[PDB]
Symmetry: D2
Subunit: 172 residues, 4 copies
């Protein structure tokens, strides 16, 4: 399933699951189960090339991908808080306000109430370069079809090293 960032940008659940599959496929090479490795690599190839999927939904438009003509897409998002010192009594009142804002679904009000609590919020967006990752998966399957399993492991690993984490303060 798809999730969303705080600014409501879509996150690809399929590409996330394909990154999980790629990592398992590499493990199964070393585990001596080469056919399960190929199946896992194939599932990631299908997840990443699904023509039903609208891949433009997940593109992070303001980040230049390594290869020309490629794009980064979002595959996960997580939260980092950083608390500054505040007297506990004034912080508690501020957090109470934040909690009511979360219950109200007010995202911007949540960030603002948290700011008054000395709390800042970073959003870490995990990204992959879609076409680079597709090419890594396809060449890896080609190497598996040649019996070059270690070399396929190298390509799968490369796809995983292509993941970046873009950490940005929250601006709504």
């Amino acid at each position: 399933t798809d999730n969303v960032t705080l600014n409501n940008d879509k996150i690809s659940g399929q590409a996330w699951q394909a990154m999980r599959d790629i990592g398992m496929s590499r493990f199964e090479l070393f585990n001596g189960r080469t056919q399960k490795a190929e199946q896992l690599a194939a599932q990631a190839e299908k997840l990443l090339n699904d023509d039903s999927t609208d891949w433009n939904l997940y593109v992070k438009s303001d980040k230049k991908a390594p290869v020309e003509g490629d794009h980064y897409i979002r595959i996960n998002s997580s939260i980092t808080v950083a608390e500054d010192y505040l007297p506990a009594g004034q912080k508690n009142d501020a957090i109470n306000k934040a909690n009511q804002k979360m219950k109200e679904g007010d995202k911007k009000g949540t960030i603002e109430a948290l700011k008054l609590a000395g709390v800042s919020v970073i959003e870490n967006q995990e990204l992959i370069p879609l076409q680079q990752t597709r090419k890594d998966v396809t060449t890896a399957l080609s190497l598996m079809n040649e019996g070059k399993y270690y070399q396929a492991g190298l390509l799968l690993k490369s796809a995983q090293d292509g993941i970046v984490v873009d950490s940005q303060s929250v601006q709504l």
Copy 2:
């Protein structure tokens, strides 16, 4: 589903999925969807306390958990290789031997052939303390039932910081 380490120790797919749920639940707090946060926290509570599950299957017996009477369990495993220098021609022959061993399902022969290629293999086992994590999830749900959403976020984060990565050279 369950996976296995190289020595064939079982890995808990449910606890893995509960760690993924915990992290999403914390995000949804900040995202201002407190009820989806509670549902995600509840799914992790059910995954982690399933009495159908044989939790002793996943225990890492030789690692002392923080809290007394608790145990670490395995929730993931991945591979790190470290290549030493070898002339390319003698390495290629060694990798050929390794690839045939992987095709043969011979794990120990794979590690040995890889050694002759200058390649060593580390297994990173991701672990969680089961009862500590259960308690974190339950208190977090209690705090959500009191409307203390930020404070529940703290407990969910603590569960995630409890994850350790045990990296060990492969011995079969």
Copy 3:
């Protein structure tokens, strides 16, 4: 503690890098029962970070909004990630030789182009900290140590470290 530069020649604060190292060591010594050593380490970080003979604008990454109003991210480290496409070895080894010559020549843009021909993409990982927010964490951590509130000081030092972010960007020199 001496400065370095990114691939684009932007300055990197070695003082700020050393403060973050001291902050980590300071927190450890708290739990190690050496609070006096913990304070000297945090005091070292505070004076590294607040040096008013240093021109902190040299280190700012201006295209990144800091969490706290009026703050800025500064560069404290740069590292390299490569990603290798599969290539006919002869074609790759040939372009690697070219990229090696460009590195000898000090030709950064030639190095990136040659590595492209070798199927190699280069990412530059810039480690950043929010300057003023980090100074405030250290200063208040020091106050807490002087008040004997050692566990609480460790909380603020940890929070300073969690402010470190890594900006991974594909290399574009021209």
Copy 4:
């Protein structure tokens, strides 16, 4: 570069820590078109790691099998992870005060017990490297730099860094 100790008082190599820092910087300078500076950094790491006036046994973590036959993991850094159970604040703040006094007193075992009463578990993260395998990576990286094979040298420096492992263990002093 000076040594420290773990919570259990086992020695930590500051020389090895500094070599790993130099190895990272050396790889960066390769791509930065400063190969001469890259070699000096790797040469610094090699002589830090191979110092035969240093007693490398002091740093060995004997309960951890290194990947290569006859090698050993050595400690290059220690850090702290805490995990806090939810506790009635009054009960927690009370035990934190006790833990703060134990840290002032330099009483490591008292600090751990007091923190337990506060719902706080302490993990010590020990960063390790395989000593001989790391020396070999650096030495051959230097050879590759002298042969003008700069990209290939970066491969070996990267491989040295990927040998770093973190042993996270709950704190047990008695």
